């Protein structure tokens, strides 16, 4: 597991850990999933942590989160999580994530970013140079 990959997972960990105490509770899992239009039950949230929870204190610290990401979670029906996630970013559904939509998703996830920073994020994912991120560029970015 590479340096950049542990830094990306550390970044994903920080967005679920809303109070910043180093553990992700079922409550933070629920609150982040509901803010992205999902509605998990208490039993589904408890199984999600029980799968990852190696030391048994009921929460997920960053070592456990790291183990989860390495031996990745399996698909039941949703094999293309890339398209599902792409639809969360592409708010108006036209097939292209603009800087405005990306800025909107970062604010919903709880972070204030400069317009230059959002513009640099678009520039990282943009392969053809049109100033936006389509689906094929979103996939390449993750694969």
């Amino acid at each position: 597991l590479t340096e950049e990959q542990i830094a990306e997972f550390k970044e994903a960990f920080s967005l679920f850990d809303k109070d910043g105490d180093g553990t992700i509770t079922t409550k933070e899992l629920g609150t982040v999933m509901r803010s992205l239009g999902q509605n998990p039950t208490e039993a589904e949230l408890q199984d999600m942590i029980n799968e990852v929870d190696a030391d048994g204190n009921g929460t997920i610290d960053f070592p456990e989160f790291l183990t989860m990401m390495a031996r990745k979670m399996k698909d039941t029906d949703s094999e293309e999580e890339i398209r599902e996630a792409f639809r969360v970013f592409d708010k108006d559904g036209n097939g292209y994530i603009s800087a405005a939509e990306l800025r909107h998703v970062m604010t919903n996830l709880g972070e204030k970013l400069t317009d230059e920073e959002v513009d640099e994020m678009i520039r990282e994912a943009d392969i053809d140079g049109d100033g936006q991120v389509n689906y094929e560029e979103f996939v390449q970015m993750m694969t």
């Binding site: 950049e4 997972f9 550390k10 970044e11 994903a12 996630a85 970013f89 990306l102 970013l113 994020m121």
Partner: peptide, 18 residues
């Protein structure tokens, strides 16, 4: 600021959340 890691971190968070 690392743009690629902030971006891929946020895409990873939505992937897991959905």
């Amino acid at each position: 600021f690392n743009a690629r890691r902030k971006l891929k971190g946020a895409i990873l968070t939505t992937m897991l959340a959905t």
